[PDB]
């Protein structure tokens, strides 16, 4: 049943409520001015959102990390 080495947990995804509010920035106007950019590759759709990082910009399902 139990073992000696401690079991490392599998990365269960966290619980975030109303997440879309930090993706589409809410300005004064009713325009969806989103700071998250758009992936120029046509293999992935425009809906499929990318990754937001600090020294790079990983794309969607294209597996192309558009670094600086």
């Amino acid at each position: 049943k139990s073992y000696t080495t401690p079991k490392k947990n599998k990365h269960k995804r966290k619980k975030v409520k109303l997440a879309v509010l930090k993706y589409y920035k809410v300005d004064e106007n009713g325009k969806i001015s989103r700071l998250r950019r758009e992936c120029p590759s046509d293999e992935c759709g425009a809906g499929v959102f990318m990754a937001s990082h600090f020294d790079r910009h990983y794309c969607g399902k294209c597996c192309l990390t558009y670094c600086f």
Binding site: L18, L21, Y24, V26, G30, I32
Partner: protein, 117 residues
């Protein structure tokens, strides 16, 4: 209007042409695919009312007003566990957009006649 909307959502669930979910609604809005939607206004939403009205009145999307959001999850049938009874282990939904394929129905014609006028 009630039987028409229930039958339209029923046949949309039959054909599975609806992209349910706020995320897939954002996919359809960014991909410019929006005909009609279901919305519940004046709820206990702390910030979401302005956001959903901003994403609704931006790209000619239909408007409908429902009282609260926790009963919105019964039209599309989210938590229909034990269908032989009133569902009880249910959470609600914010909005459901439907890309309708079976658009021709019994009274959706006069619903869109109201919508266009």
């Amino acid at each position: 209007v009630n039987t028409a909307l229930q039958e339209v959502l029923k046949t949309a669930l039959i054909h599975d042409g609806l992209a349910r979910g706020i995320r897939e609604a954002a996919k359809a809005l960014d991909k410019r695919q929006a005909h009609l939607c279901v919305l519940a206004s004046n709820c206990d939403e702390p910030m979401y009312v302005k956001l959903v009205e901003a994403l609704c009145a931006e790209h000619q999307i239909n408007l409908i007003k429902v009282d609260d959001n926790k009963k919105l999850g019964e039209w599309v049938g989210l938590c229909k566990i034990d269908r032989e009874g009133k569902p009880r282990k249910v959470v609600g939904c914010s909005c459901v957009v439907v890309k309708d394929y079976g658009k021709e129905s019994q009274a959706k014609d006069v619903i869109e006649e109201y919508f266009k006028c």
